[PDB]
Structure 1
């Protein structure tokens, strides 16, 4: 059985790398008991002296302990004594949206397709574990290296806060139905975000008006330079009827073909 509780004396806290919902997040080192020292992200919790806040903070770490996939951020462990910390693997290049925005004129198309392919393998793995992510968006993706992205936020995930309406499948908005097919819809939006270099979907459109546009058959437009076969795949993720959406295993196979076709120019 994997380690869950880890010793604070084995963590060296480094620089602050941003803010989380419960408190600041720092970069650091985990001095692994039998392996080399690992670079980690240490999530801190400001009010975790309250066991009620501690329970909410640790809920995501409980979910993460069940996963082991190369394109899903790894939980290293937690420290339940005050101050409560969640120790994740560090993805050195940070948040996907910022990374793509900064490199909009330098990242080749094959890298953007590779990120979408890697994410489809992580979502097929989640489906195989009976989890619905419910929050698939570029903001929840992290960059380990130029050729490796990882799904890193599991706050809304469920073993089967403001709603991300602009990413949600119509049956999720209308009936609170969350399935692997509704994750496919969200993944289509996340692929659109990657191909748009981190631009958000439906900018300047009110959340309450998104519903109407989707219901009327309106969809996110073809990103400039997106291969037509890839945009067609995105539109299939946005079929109104969830039964007409592709499955994650089909998305993975089709993205592999699209990636291969781009690498051969």
Structure 2
């Protein structure tokens, strides 16, 4: 049972905006040991069976996952207003993390995040679960040497595979597409794909064989890897499991001086 007694949660400051309700930072007095630092997801329209049914699902799917790079579900307070209690990634959102530390983070660390991210995403495909919004803005930083993927609830045109724009099909292979943009965002230190480019043009550009530039200082093997993620024909994109191993040697390569 993931049910938590509200007495054991002190709600704190607010840290995000989802589209059910705000995200808060808080404290959890477990008897496990001392006062854990949690993130608390809340719901605005609790006064309705429908919204609650779905809001809770997020927590109920998250149960099934256990992985070093996916935020844990600590528990749920199922009584109005409903709260999902999960682990706090203290160092915050990846884009802001990278921007601040543009000139203090090495290539190896950047490649490390991409890799960790891919262990997460490989983990999820092994569970048939499709994310639908892989992007830096949905990646939280737990430590210097540790990022985690967050969510998981049901338009980011600049991130999406063509087939997601054209025919609203979301699959593992569309995920791989978005992951590529994500590596690009990482390697660009949280700079958005297609800044200064209207959504509707972006769709045409991609339609015409155009792709995101190779980020400066990104090592060619890796950029080669990103471009594979952006095969238009979904079947030509690598599986997450191959990305993982690709990214591994690429990292060991950079680490190996």
Query: What displacement does 1:262 show?
Result: 1.0
How far the C-alpha of 1:35 sits from its partner, in A, is 4.1
Distance between the aligned counterparts of 1:142 and 1:89, measured in 2? 11
Aligned partners of 1:262 and 1:237: how far apart in 2?
21
Whole-Å separation in 1 of the counterparts to 2:112 and 2:130: 23
TM-score of the superposed pair, with normalisation by structure 1: 0.92
How far apart are residue 258 of structure 1 and its match?
A: 0.8
Query: What are the Cα deviations for residues 123-155 of structure 1, in whole angstroms up to 9, with x where unaligned?
Result: 000000011111111100000001000001212
Unaligned runs of 5+ in 2: none
Number of aligned residue pairs: 257
The root-mean-square deviation of aligned C-alpha atoms, in Å, is: 1.4
Secondary structure at 1:132's aligned position in 2?
coil
Q: 1:52 Cα deviation (Å)?
A: 2.7
Shift of 1:70: 0.6
In the alignment, the residues of structure 2 paired with residue 57 and residue 97 of structure 1 have an alpha-carbon distance, to the nearest angstrom, of: 26
Whole-Å Cα distance in 2 between the matches of residues 214 and 89 of structure 1?
37
Query: How far, CA to CA, are the matches of 1:18 and 1:247 in structure 2?
Result: 32
- Quote the offset at 1:36 in angstroms: 4.0
Distance 2:81 2:128 in 1: 32
Distance apart, 1:50 and its partner CA: 2.6
Other structure's SS at 2:67 match: coil
Unaligned runs of 5+ in 1: 157-162
Give the stretch that moved more between structures: 107-116 or 165-174: 165-174
Cα distance in structure 2, aligned partners of 1:254 and 1:24: 38
Structure-2 separation of matches of 1:234 and 1:66: 29
Q: 1:232 to 1:99 in 2, by over 3 A?
A: same
Aligned to 1:47: 45
Aligned structure 1 segments of 4 or more residues deviating by more than 4 angstroms? none
TM-score, length-scaled by structure 2: 0.95
* Structure 1 segment 178-189 matched on structure 2, within 5 A: 178-189=170-181
SS in 2 for 1:232: helix
